[PDB]
Design a protein around this ligand. Structure first.
Ligand SMILES: CCC1=C(C)/C(=C/C2=NC(=C\c3[nH]c(/C=C4\NC(=O)[C@H](C)[C@H]4CC)c(C)c3CCC(=O)O)/C(CCC(=O)O)=C2C)NC1=O
Ligand SMILES: CCC1=C(C)/C(=C/C2=NC(=C\c3[nH]c(/C=C4\NC(=O)[C@H](C)[C@H]4CC)c(C)c3CCC(=O)O)/C(CCC(=O)O)=C2C)NC1=O
Ligand SMILES: CCC1=C(C)/C(=C/C2=NC(=C\c3[nH]c(/C=C4\NC(=O)[C@H](C)[C@H]4CC)c(C)c3CCC(=O)O)/C(CCC(=O)O)=C2C)NC1=O
Ligand SMILES: CCC1=C(C)/C(=C/C2=NC(=C\c3[nH]c(/C=C4\NC(=O)[C@H](C)[C@H]4CC)c(C)c3CCC(=O)O)/C(CCC(=O)O)=C2C)NC1=O
Ligand SMILES: CCC1=C(C)/C(=C/C2=NC(=C\c3[nH]c(/C=C4\NC(=O)[C@H](C)[C@H]4CC)c(C)c3CCC(=O)O)/C(CCC(=O)O)=C2C)NC1=O
Ligand SMILES: CCC1=C(C)/C(=C/C2=NC(=C\c3[nH]c(/C=C4\NC(=O)[C@H](C)[C@H]4CC)c(C)c3CCC(=O)O)/C(CCC(=O)O)=C2C)NC1=O
Ligand SMILES: CCC1=C(C)/C(=C/C2=NC(=C\c3[nH]c(/C=C4\NC(=O)[C@H](C)[C@H]4CC)c(C)c3CCC(=O)O)/C(CCC(=O)O)=C2C)NC1=O
Ligand SMILES: CCC1=C(C)/C(=C/C2=NC(=C\c3[nH]c(/C=C4\NC(=O)[C@H](C)[C@H]4CC)c(C)c3CCC(=O)O)/C(CCC(=O)O)=C2C)NC1=O
Lengths: 148, 172, 162, 162, 172, 162
């Protein structure tokens, strides 16, 4: 149905991205099997092409979800000014964090490298681990390292 | 995500065989007694503000050094995040209680929580204590006989206690 | 897997809320709908090998050329592993009955079906009408309430194959 | 609004596929106990006058400060507004009951409740106590399953307010 | 997206008065025949590919210009689009039937559908004939008494015929 | 309807003479037989439901292998109709007890029994075992004469089943 909508032109490519993000595949892979941290990382990486820049992004998006639901959480990504300026209505999202994007922290590059995992790799969730979050400590302890 | 039925099914499939008669008996008993489970899940859902508030009162009346300045629940943003985490953990416990399986809890609340709380400096011992206090406040509510028919639900009490203990032992 | 309980939890989870009345309503419907389904699963499991033999011979009777030399049904391995495939379909129909949802079918069979049928040239019609034979045989194997459930899942498998 | 049929149809249309076993089972679970819900709504639609006056007087009792002059509770038009408010809440509880879901309750009371309440300076505990009294007396006016449905829906309203 | 219950609640709130006795009684009736309704929508869902295939066969037989080069369903792409539209129409018809209200059909399936075909050059008369043949096949598959307990469902057949016919009229 | 007096009438009317000593004496004898049979039938009519149900469970207990999926009796309706069958035969036992002859039995059930059983695949041995259960109880329930002719009638019933 979404592909037919796109072919007719009732929805732009951005609206189709929104529909796929609200689809059951996106949930069953990235939301339902993962903590909220991993979900925010994946949302940034997939709908914005960038890694999270700081911990306030995680806090804001977790509160947005807890108060308004998955649909509002997704809308905050696609209707954001950043998606509209970078990709707009008619461009497919791509990994733009590899080249310096205006306003990014120093870490966004390293975090996108940590998320990437190569051209073959993927955000599967069928791993033996179960889609754990990668950037839990790189976001709140951006520089240092701690052992338990 | 899983429940009891899908867990038995997955075990049987990984083995490659139909579900045996005994396992069908177990799932039939589960479904037959699931009405008590619905009552318990409702007891958690409907009183949840009371559980959260009583647990918060007790936690901050026994562990003062959280609400002190420099304590890690000092401002309203940190106190609000504390209460929000308490509610979320209680929510996933009620979920896992309805499902009969703790997989949703271990996959959405507990698979990266100890690491997050360590990376934020929050004392995971106090978080586990908060979870146990919520367990106590909830058990005061699951044993309520008002508005429900009398019966025995020791099994559901044990199951909910083990879910709270799973949350505590996977945060602490 | 997508069941009534799991779908309820995922819907009340994605919205960030507790389980309200409608969700427990659906859960209760599942819990009391379970017993006919469990009985249907017990019956299908008891009558498993007979059903598989019947569906295999139905495939061969309706598709007589398939067993002729030079193509798919020729040779003992392909018959034994036809039996294997029908056993798989039957097993997952019973799994979906017990779980009272189309989780197991949509996961272990329906997801990825067209690609592997295309890449092996397995005609879906063989499986569609073997499932039709099982659909018929449950009429005299089951009866009453659980017959509707068993027919419903045999039916979903047939629709997905087509 | 949002009734069990409403989520069933919405979820089925979201994947763009027909209603499978799970959706029909959910609709059946809603349908079979539509009768305790409707009889409970019938039982608490005859007593609406007693309900509203009892709730208003219980709110006055529990909160003495909302009675004397110098505040919103005092006033003939303000007390007429209080009675109208309680009547609206009870009517939307009846709508939730007949819908067999929280839909009408949601999109009549719960949605946009905080800021609407706040911009007019009304204590949420007021209506929480009113609904608590409604809970108390509907526990006795209704018995068994109808009582269960009532308790659940009025408490969902309370939790929304609180 | 409204059902009979939501619609009736809407008029009841438009009036502002409580729901009456008679309307609530007919809603309880609607609940009682809800099981026959669920079997009706099940009969529609179960046989959807067969209904689409037979209706398509009859339609393409009656209008050979659709198939021939230059027709509106000539290439494989346009035939696939035709069959997909037929299936979507039947899907929304079943949605409306289970909801018991034509609102589901009209609110999303019929809004811009009427003029999209005209802008595409699609003859809407052929679409009306397609859904009419679909209605005939659906009636045939609905009167079937196999595998189900027998009873009166004439109101269901009339309601389904109304849904199919108003879908035809709105498209045309 | 060949009660003893009925074949008395048949023998009388077949030829031209009136009734002689033998048939009058036989009619007298039957007319004292009428009593103990009448208390037997009354006692059995007093003990209807427990006896019929116990017969049904006895049939289960002596024939457990059918009780699996495979009974023609499997399912609530079919077990209930087993019970109603036993009730029908108990009816006919009482009727033949009153009639002092095999009249009801041979007229209705014994008439065309074997071919009906063949058509409906109902093993008589089940019925026979049920009547052996009845033997067991009637050994206690009735005494002396009533017992004796009741036992003889149900013996003839066994033989009819064989
Ligand atoms: C919201 C509900 C909905 C509707 C109403 C719908 C209809 C619909 N049909 C379309 C194309 C089409 N539709 C048809 C079908 C018609 N032409 C033939 O003559 C048949 C007789 C007749 C079918 C009964 C055909 C042949 C096309 C292909 C035209 C093209 O590809 O440009 C398109 C645009 C392309 C696409 O779907 O990818 C839409 C939106 N789709 C929807 O999601
Ligand atoms: C969806 C499942 C999920 C949960 C629940 C979760 C917990 C979680 N808690 C957080 C912070 C926090 N968590 C707490 C709670 C602690 N403070 C006190 O010591 C208490 C003992 C204890 C609570 C009982 C506090 C105070 C913060 C804020 C700390 C900060 O802002 O640095 C954060 C990150 C920043 C934020 O929320 O503002 C997460 C992600 N993560 C998840 O993926
Ligand atoms: C809409 C959501 C929903 C609710 C709320 C619900 C409650 C519910 N509880 C029931 C019985 C019951 N409820 C309880 C639970 C209580 N008794 C125990 O002692 C505790 C005090 C407490 C639980 C810890 C028990 C034990 C039964 C009887 C068990 C049975 O039904 O066999 C019944 C069946 C009536 C009966 O058999 O008596 C219902 C419908 N069902 C639903 O579909
Ligand atoms: C999860 C459940 C599951 C299914 C359903 C399944 C189907 C399946 N059937 C296969 C082969 C096959 N399946 C058949 C079935 C035919 N045999 C007779 O002739 C009949 C006409 C007909 C069956 C009704 C045949 C002939 C092959 C061998 C074809 C080949 O090797 O290319 C294969 C390729 C792997 C192999 O068996 O070597 C798959 C994946 N596999 C699964 O793991
Ligand atoms: C159907 C949706 C709906 C709701 C939920 C509703 C509540 C409500 N009551 C109002 C007025 C009022 N309501 C009250 C009653 C409160 N103050 C005290 O008297 C009591 C303790 C307490 C009741 C338990 C009062 C005093 C006013 C006067 C105006 C004001 O305070 O804003 C208002 C402001 C606008 C108006 O209606 O005049 C709302 C929104 N009204 C609605 O149309
Ligand atoms: C763009 C060009 C184009 C192609 C190629 C095309 C294929 C095509 N062939 C058709 C008819 C058909 N064609 C065949 C022929 C097959 N069966 C045997 O005879 C042979 C092994 C084999 C051909 C060598 C058959 C049997 C049908 C009827 C199918 C049916 O009505 O079920 C139909 C259905 C038309 C109808 O009757 O409603 C299509 C769509 N359609 C197109 O628009
Ligand atoms: C879980 C999903 C679901 C299923 C599988 C389902 C089948 C279903 N059909 C039923 C009865 C029935 N169903 C029908 C409708 C049929 N009779 C005629 O043949 C019509 C052609 C046809 C309408 C399409 C009728 C007339 C009855 C008996 C009357 C009654 O429901 O009380 C019942 C209730 C009593 C029973 O049969 O044991 C169920 C559960 N209903 C459901 O909600
Ligand atoms: C006085 C005249 C009379 C007779 C002779 C009688 C026996 C009798 N048994 C029948 C079938 C049946 N009879 C039984 C009971 C038997 N099957 C089980 O194995 C038990 C061991 C056993 C009970 C002792 C059952 C379960 C059926 C259903 C089989 C079918 O419908 O094909 C039927 C067919 C009609 C129906 O479906 O109800 C009759 C008439 N009932 C009568 O009113």
């Amino acid at each position: 149905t979404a592909e037919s909508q796109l072919k007719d032109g009732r929805i732009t490519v951005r609206g189709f991205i929104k529909l796929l993000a609200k689809s059951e595949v996106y949930r069953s892979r990235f939301f339902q099997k993962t903590s909220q941290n991993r979900f925010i990382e994946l949302n940034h990486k997939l709908l914005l092409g960038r890694a999270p820049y700081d911990q306030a992004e995680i806090s804001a998006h977790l509160d947005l979800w807890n108060t308004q639901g998955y649909d509002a959480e997704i809308d905050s990504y696609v209707e954001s000014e950043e998606y509209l300026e970078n990709f707009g209505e008619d461009v497919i999202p791509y990994f733009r964090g590899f080249k310096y994007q205006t306003g990014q922290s120093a870490q966004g590059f390293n975090r996108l490298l940590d998320l990437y995992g190569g051209w073959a790799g993927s955000d599967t969730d069928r791993n033996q681990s179960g889609q754990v979050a990668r950037l839990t400590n790189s976001l709140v302890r951006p520089g240092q390292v701690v052992e338990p | 995500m899983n429940d009891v039925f899908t867990r038995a099914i997955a075990q049987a499939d990984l083995k490659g065989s139909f579900l045996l008669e005994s396992d069908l008996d177990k799932l039939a008993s589960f479904a037959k007694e699931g009405v008590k489970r619905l009552d318990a899940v409702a007891a958690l859902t409907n009183n949840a503000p009371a559980i959260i508030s009583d647990a918060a009162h007790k936690l901050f009346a026994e562990q003062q050094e959280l609400i002190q300045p420099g304590g890690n629940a000092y401002p309203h943003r940190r106190m609000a995040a504390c209460l929000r985490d308490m509610e979320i953990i209680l929510r996933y416990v009620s979920y896992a209680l309805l499902a009969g399986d703790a997989s949703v809890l271990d996959d959405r609340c507990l698979n990266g929580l100890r690491e997050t709380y360590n990376a934020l400096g929050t004392p995971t011992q106090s978080v586990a204590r908060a979870v146990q206090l919520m367990k106590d406040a909830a058990m005061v509510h699951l044993k309520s006989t008002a508005n429900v028919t009398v019966g025995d639900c020791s099994s559901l009490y044990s199951e909910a206690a083990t879910y709270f203990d799973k949350a505590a032992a996977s945060i602490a | 897997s997508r069941t009534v309980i799991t779908e309820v939890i995922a819907t009340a989870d994605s919205q960030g809320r507790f389980l309200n009345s409608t969700e427990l309503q659906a859960a209760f419907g599942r819990f009391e709908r379970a017993v006919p389904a469990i009985e249907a699963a017990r019956a299908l499991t008891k009558n498993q090998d007979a059903l598989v033999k019947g569906a295999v011979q139905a495939v061969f009777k309706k598709f007589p050329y398939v067993t002729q030399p030079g193509e798919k049904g020729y040779g003992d391995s392909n018959q034994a592993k036809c039996a294997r495939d029908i056993g798989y379909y039957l097993r997952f129909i019973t799994y979906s009955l017990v779980a009272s949802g189309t989780g197991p079918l949509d996961d272990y069979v329906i997801a990825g079906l067209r690609e592997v049928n295309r890449a092996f040239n397995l005609n879906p019609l063989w499986y569609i009408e073997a499932l039709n034979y099982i659909k018929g045989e449950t009429g005299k194997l089951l009866s009453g309430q659980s017959k509707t459930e068993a027919l419903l899942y045999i039916d979903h498998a047939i629709n997905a194959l087509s």
